Ligand binder design. Sequence first.
Ligand SMILES: CC(=O)O[C@H]1C(=O)[C@@]2(C)[C@H]([C@H](OC(=O)c3ccccc3)[C@]3(O)C[C@H](OC(=O)[C@H](O)[C@@H](NC(=O)c4ccccc4)c4ccccc4)C(C)=C1C3(C)C)[C@]1(OC(C)=O)CO[C@@H]1C[C@@H]2O
Ligand SMILES: CC(=O)O[C@H]1C(=O)[C@@]2(C)[C@H]([C@H](OC(=O)c3ccccc3)[C@]3(O)C[C@H](OC(=O)[C@H](O)[C@@H](NC(=O)c4ccccc4)c4ccccc4)C(C)=C1C3(C)C)[C@]1(OC(C)=O)CO[C@@H]1C[C@@H]2O
Ligand SMILES: Nc1nc2c(ncn2[C@@H]2O[C@H](COP(=O)(O)OP(=O)(O)OP(=O)(O)O)[C@@H](O)[C@H]2O)c(=O)[nH]1
Ligand SMILES: Nc1nc2c(ncn2[C@@H]2O[C@H](COP(=O)(O)OP(=O)(O)OP(=O)(O)O)[C@@H](O)[C@H]2O)c(=O)[nH]1
Ligand SMILES: Nc1nc2c(ncn2[C@@H]2O[C@H](COP(=O)(O)OP(=O)(O)O)[C@@H](O)[C@H]2O)c(=O)[nH]1
Ligand SMILES: [Mg+2]
Ligand SMILES: [Mg+2]
Lengths: 118, 426, 426, 428, 428
Amino acid sequence: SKSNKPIIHAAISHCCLAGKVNEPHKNSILEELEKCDANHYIILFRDAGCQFRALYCYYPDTEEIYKLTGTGPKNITKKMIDKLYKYSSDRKQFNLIPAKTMSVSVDALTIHNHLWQP
Amino acid sequence: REIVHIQAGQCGNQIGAKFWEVISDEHGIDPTGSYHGDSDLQLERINVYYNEAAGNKYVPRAILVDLEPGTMDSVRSGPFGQIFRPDNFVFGQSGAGNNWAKGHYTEGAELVDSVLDVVRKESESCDCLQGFQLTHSLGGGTGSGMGTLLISKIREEYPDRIMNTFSVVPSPKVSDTVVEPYNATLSVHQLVENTDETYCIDNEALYDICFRTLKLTTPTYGDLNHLVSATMSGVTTCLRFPGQLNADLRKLAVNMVPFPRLHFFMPGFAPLTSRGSQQYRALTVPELTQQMFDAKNMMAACDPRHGRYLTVAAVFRGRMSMKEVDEQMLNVQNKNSSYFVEWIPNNVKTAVCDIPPRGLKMSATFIGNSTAIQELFKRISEQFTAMFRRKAFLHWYTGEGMDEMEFTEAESNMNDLVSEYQQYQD
Amino acid sequence: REIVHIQAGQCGNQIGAKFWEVISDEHGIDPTGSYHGDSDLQLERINVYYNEAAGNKYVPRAILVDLEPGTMDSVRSGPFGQIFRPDNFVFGQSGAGNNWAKGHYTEGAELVDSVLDVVRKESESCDCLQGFQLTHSLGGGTGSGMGTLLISKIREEYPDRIMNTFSVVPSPKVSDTVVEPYNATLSVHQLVENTDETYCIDNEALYDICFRTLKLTTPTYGDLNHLVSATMSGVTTCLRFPGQLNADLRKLAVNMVPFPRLHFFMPGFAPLTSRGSQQYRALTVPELTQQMFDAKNMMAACDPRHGRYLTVAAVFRGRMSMKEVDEQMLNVQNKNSSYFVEWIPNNVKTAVCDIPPRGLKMSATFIGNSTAIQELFKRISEQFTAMFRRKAFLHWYTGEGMDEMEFTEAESNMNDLVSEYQQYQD
Amino acid sequence: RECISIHVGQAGVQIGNACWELYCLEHGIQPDGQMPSFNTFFSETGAGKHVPRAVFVDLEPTVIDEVRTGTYRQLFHPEQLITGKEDAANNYARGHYTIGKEIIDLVLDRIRKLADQCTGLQGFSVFHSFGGGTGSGFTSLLMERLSVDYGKKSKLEFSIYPAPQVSTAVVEPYNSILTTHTTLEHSDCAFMVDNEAIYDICRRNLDIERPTYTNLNRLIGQIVSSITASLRFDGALNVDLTEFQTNLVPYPRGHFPLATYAPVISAEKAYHEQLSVAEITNACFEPANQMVKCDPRHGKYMACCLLYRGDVVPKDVNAAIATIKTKRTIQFVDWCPTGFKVGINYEPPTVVPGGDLAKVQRAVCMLSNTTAIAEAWARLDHKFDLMYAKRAFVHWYVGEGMEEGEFSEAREDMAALEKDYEEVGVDS
Amino acid sequence: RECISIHVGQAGVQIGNACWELYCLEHGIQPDGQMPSFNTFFSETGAGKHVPRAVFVDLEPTVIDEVRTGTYRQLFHPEQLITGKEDAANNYARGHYTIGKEIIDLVLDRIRKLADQCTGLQGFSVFHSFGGGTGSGFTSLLMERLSVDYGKKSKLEFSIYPAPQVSTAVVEPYNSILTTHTTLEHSDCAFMVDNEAIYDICRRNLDIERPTYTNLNRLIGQIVSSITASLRFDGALNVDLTEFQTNLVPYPRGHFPLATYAPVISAEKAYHEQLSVAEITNACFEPANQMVKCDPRHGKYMACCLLYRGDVVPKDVNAAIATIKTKRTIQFVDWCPTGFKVGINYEPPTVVPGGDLAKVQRAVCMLSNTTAIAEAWARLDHKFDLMYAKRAFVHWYVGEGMEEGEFSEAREDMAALEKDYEEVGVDS
Ligand SMILES: CC(=O)O[C@H]1C(=O)[C@@]2(C)[C@H]([C@H](OC(=O)c3ccccc3)[C@]3(O)C[C@H](OC(=O)[C@H](O)[C@@H](NC(=O)c4ccccc4)c4ccccc4)C(C)=C1C3(C)C)[C@]1(OC(C)=O)CO[C@@H]1C[C@@H]2O
Ligand SMILES: CC(=O)O[C@H]1C(=O)[C@@]2(C)[C@H]([C@H](OC(=O)c3ccccc3)[C@]3(O)C[C@H](OC(=O)[C@H](O)[C@@H](NC(=O)c4ccccc4)c4ccccc4)C(C)=C1C3(C)C)[C@]1(OC(C)=O)CO[C@@H]1C[C@@H]2O
Ligand SMILES: Nc1nc2c(ncn2[C@@H]2O[C@H](COP(=O)(O)OP(=O)(O)OP(=O)(O)O)[C@@H](O)[C@H]2O)c(=O)[nH]1
Ligand SMILES: Nc1nc2c(ncn2[C@@H]2O[C@H](COP(=O)(O)OP(=O)(O)OP(=O)(O)O)[C@@H](O)[C@H]2O)c(=O)[nH]1
Ligand SMILES: Nc1nc2c(ncn2[C@@H]2O[C@H](COP(=O)(O)OP(=O)(O)O)[C@@H](O)[C@H]2O)c(=O)[nH]1
Ligand SMILES: [Mg+2]
Ligand SMILES: [Mg+2]
């Protein structure tokens, strides 16, 4: 079926989790991507500066938003999302999406700043 | 909507050198990159193939892949190498010497990351990519083995683009080494899972086409590739140039493929005629389709009257009327419906390009998928059965560090492919 | 707003000789000091570098420092020494012979007070002091050792000005003496407390830059310094020449330095290409920033993808649009935020100069600070650990009258310098 | 007093290239916008130059490139030139969902700008196809959103329907199944255009043996210009578009009309010619002029709307209606006894400079609702059946987020569609 | 009947280079001072040549060197050419305290000479930025001293605010915190200018893909010329600047207005253009024309001042106000029911010789007070927070004698600033 799983694997391996310092980080994550049964993987971001915070397993139906790996909350409401993100492969960068119903075509997101604790 | 052409091996670098020889001649381009054409058609769609530099210079968005400079040494010292930048001349020392396990698994992978980074340098320089074009041999060691690791990395990088390569099918008559069917065996085991499509080219078929229909005396490989490049250019210029039935290749990949593993195609070229038959033959729309339908115009040694057509693509070039196109398309379906599948009402996809080529008033390009392509694949497998038992010169590939059941897994995956065509055959 | 350029040592006198070769050629100036330029841009900012004499003659506000005439004998006998007044040729006999303790502590200080008075002669002749410029080697005994006393006295005289030097980092491959890492060890122990900033130069890194990207055959030290001087001229001429983002170096020193002791910078130069890629490469703003971003365009042997960027300065040259500048600046931050610090949203400072250089339409100068510069310091320190134990040829420096715990005090200060990068690293 | 023409897909733009060319022919409009006096299809500026109230939809640049670089580009404003960058790849899932969703926020707001320009918005018209990629997927997305925005406006689709014999792409039946449900869910009136019957018209009623998509659409847009602007223009018996919502479909879901037009006269046929009003109406009942390959002889007629041009005498019209009752082979239904709504334009029909259509003095457009249309849907049905039996082509849409149950769902939507038109003919 | 333009910082001169160029365009003024008749921005001598009533502030020679060696240098008087010798090093402390204190004795008395020349001083305007060195530190020093001198005059700042994405210097949030407290302490009205939103305007409403600071400021100064001289010039409904102290800010500390201007028409857009008064006001409510990257949709509107140019019919203005009440997505506050002050100029707007703005027959400036502006200050807040968390960049100001407690003080000044605009939206 439809799956964002290789693209998210292509997203962090070249843009987000690049670097030799992130190589201990991503080796925990690439095995974790093989563990989950969901075809739909979503990356968490604090701001539009593209700083890797966490990873989610969102599905367009009522399946879990549940935090798989990374620093963040466990449960994120659909009110909590602010801006929706995708990944152009050819640019090796992200692009903005207008506000809509989130689904498999969405690749990443950001959330509210008061939800971030100091 | 841009395309990168990754040419590989001793063959496909020589083969695709003829390709850009055509396209630069097609748009009125100087050998050094200057524009001298006269049409906005030759001016608007430069973006798909070429990168505009300073001084009205157009850089071929295309990288030559080899473990040896000598092939590219001939291209750079030859004509049209002066438009190529040295960034595309990626080479090492030494070469694998027609060995799949050396370039793919042990040695070439060091040069692969140097290739892939320049791909990353160029793909970021693009506006928007549409897909990556390739050309090599199936039994080519540096051609396929390097590329089989490349397509594994590129699909890992870019799942969103079309993965097509242009494959040279190993002729049962023409071989220089005996371990040549080993290389095509290990290729298709990764070519099925990693590529979106490919085309089938046999020089053994093209020897008849140059001789039985064109009456040519001494063809070179480039004379064969002079025919190949027109079939290469017939596919993708319709994606570029305007037309009524402007069909994407990604549109074409949907219609030509019912099952995602069945993506091996039979190219064809309709306006094939010699110089003596120029004065005997008129140029009509039914004239080309009769040579579309003929068995002796196919680039692969297969009997299309023996197998059955899965999907057909009808790429046309020139100023044609839609009534004459569609009725002549329909009558072939009316005549030989035994040659087709049962469960599809129209196996033929039409692609009318309003833009004509130069020289001819009309042209056409046949693209088909049939059940007869398993015939060449059984020539691979039945040779592979005897050669596996005696293990002739296996210790070359054994010292490189490969396993015998990996060959059997490649054999079983090839044994899948034999079973795959038969289940939709009848 | 004037600058004095104090060149020292056998190296930095030869190195900075290429610098004034550029600048006198930059402004259309005769080798004997006559003006022949055509722009008011070349006519207005003569004050910052040169001293106007009688007869339209421009005296370089620069002093060559050596314990030997031979290097200045080459400059005075060579081209462009004729513009130098004899007052700037200060020398003695004999030289130290690459010994830090001899020039700094015992012998060279007698010549230092003769230099500093002529510094007081020229700085009082200035209209407004802005900062004093230096260039030497870290392993230069007369280059750094004399200068370590010079920077200590000038900062004691003029705390209000910028103290910068252009230091040659000791390559792990290139050594002529074995006590060469001793000289860089004793330098930085006083360079941190006395200098506001410095730049990092490694000839070992430049050997790759001349060969992998420029394809040069036989590079000299002047061929190395021909690259260095353009990076030298990119910094301070933007303080001189007009522009939209006219950024002072003292403005730059605030933004590039978050912690007062950590002021070691990674210079870079963007329009690097050979003659073959001149006809093949377009000149755009994303073209240069991609070579700003490349690891292989850095003047010091460090992996910037290993460490993380503290601060980035983006000096640009040419007629550019601000939108293309600001977006391309942003997109690097959008891609590789892992390469940055966390506590600053914008680590990149942009410096757009409206004035173009000659020959090229666009040019750029990269200045960065990262955590990866401690890698070369660990190459210094770990060699310094072995060399301190066996005390090889220590009796040369011991007879000069220096203490072993002073070396350890320099070592512990060097050891803390390793820690200060790590505490802001992650 | 104004409406909008919408051109979704490669075809609907290529039709509208002839339509607004005919709309320039409506007043002799110069390619700058100069015309002596009419503001229904146009917006007039202070410079006296008129711009079309049109919508140009494409996800490729290529078809737009012929528009923006050819003639009449001084008439068009690039607000209406809406282009994409990545193709829909002839996909419903990329048409309805994946690719077009990044453009729909631009496209809907372009309409709201142009709807703000209008005073007395009567509705709009959409030109697309049934089996296309953009004209099927994105049309299903666009007509959905416009129904949410403007519920009580006119929603017109003049759609191209594929031939049972001639198809340019294999997924054309495979796309049209999902399109047709959301078409029936939203649209007010949806036409079906088959090129194969038009091929028979060109070779016989014009005797033209070399047609292109230009030569087809010159015929089609001439009909639509008599459909749309001529009902807006002044005549003897003036009907507006809203009464076609009244007196053409007496049903909630019945709005697939069949349109005919049979003055189709070649220039050589012009001198062997003496054609009255009633002689054209007999040609309107001929199988050779139905514009869709069908057999209306076996179809029960529900509604018959007549649209006239030029030389009209209403007493002669009444004899032509009496000619229908006398020559009866039509099997007209008993639910409506004599509902034959007439439209009369005083204006003569126009002749394309460059076309091959002769000058007539009367032009007749006939709308029909007949029961034999579902036989063409029955031809479309087994095309969907055999592909779904093998589950062919399924990975291009399941890979883009479509469900295989939705295929059988829309087939049941297609089946209930075939149940509905059966209920008209069966019940009496 | 007169006022003063003050240009502090590198930017405020570079803006005023276009502004006084547009002020030459106000009367077709020759570069010597020759003009047929107007004395509000100028001083007239016996030679009939006019010099500006302007202030040029720079601590470097460099920006002044382009002024005194370029065009219009015969217009400028060397009294107003005030230059420095040592840079402020992009510092607040060298701007406000250290370096500027030996220049301020010159600068204040230059104003007092020019204030002595005026008869009926209404006030003055200052051009600077928030995060600069000169236009932040010295502006904090200048606006303090001018408030001591002239307490009951107009104090105007049209300030450049840094983008959350694009910042040309790292200390631009680190300088703007100390600036903003003394800004709110002294200034009567302070505008915010974000180049990032203007970048979106040039690439879309003008389709310009190569702008510089020239092309940005020509847009900005065209607005300010309609703000300043046009309200001073005669029209149908004449408003002065003192009523903006009345009818724009009903608060003691609330004066951060948002300014929009949306006739922004490229020359190719101009041939297909019929834009009424109400159609521009809907573009004034668009997010793409707000001049600051913000979302006014989530912001409650306090005051809306409308400033018109050229072709104005007041009955059509009343329909445009009725358009605002009907299209409501605005969440207008309940404290003021209908405070919509109108400004009408009879004069047409001007076109830059050399610019890229087409000729229109009506131009609309809209002032707005919305609550979403503090979210941009909230973006500025955490930029100051993380740098104060690591205590980065502190040693450049500790060495100049600035206290670290003043940073958290001004943060509490920034926090109470964010408390104040929250109190408007929360309370009702
Ligand atoms: C006097 C003259 O013009 O003669 C023709 C010609 O008579 C024939 C024999 C040509 C000729 O082609 C060959 O002889 C041939 C031999 C081996 C492999 C390929 C071609 C011709 O070379 C080929 C050439 O065709 C083209 O140039 C096309 O535009 C073609 N371009 C090239 O192949 C090409 C040639 C040189 C340099 C660069 C490109 C093309 C085809 C498809 C898509 C784009 C371009 C033409 C008209 C001619 C000659 C010279 C004899 C034919 O081929 C083509 C491709 O047109 C062979 O079948 C046709 C029939 C033509 O009548
Ligand atoms: C035919 C022609 O014009 O050729 C060019 C040229 O093609 C190239 C190869 C030049 C050339 O530079 C080198 O080959 C080179 C080698 C080692 C170290 C430094 C330079 C050039 O020498 C350098 C020279 O550049 C300049 O003159 C700049 O103004 C430069 N000035 C000097 O370097 C200089 C040279 C001699 C005497 C005094 C000054 C400069 C750079 C930064 C700031 C101010 C000035 C130019 C245009 C050329 C040649 C001759 C080949 C390049 O360099 C520069 C600095 O422009 C190398 O990368 C660029 C790309 C250029 O295309
Ligand atoms: N009559 C007519 N039919 C046309 C024309 N252009 C295309 N068609 C028909 O349109 C159908 C193909 O649809 P497409 O136009 O390719 O699809 P699309 O909706 O435009 O969108 P994409 O497939 O995503 O490019 C076929 O039945 C063609 O015969 C035209 O100008 N006239
Ligand atoms: N729109 C616009 N912004 C400008 C212009 N010139 C500079 N800026 C902005 O102003 C800020 C930099 O201000 P500076 O000029 O360095 O500040 P200053 O007030 O001159 O003080 P110093 O730092 O001491 O030179 C950045 O946000 C620039 O983008 C201009 O002409 N137009
Ligand atoms: N048609 C054609 N076949 C070629 C060409 N060069 C080599 N071949 C064939 O391809 C095979 C050798 O491929 P090669 O490119 O040398 O393999 P590799 O370089 O080791 O990857 C043999 O069957 C050759 O006959 C060429 O230019 N054209
Ligand atoms: Mg289309
Ligand atoms: Mg300043």
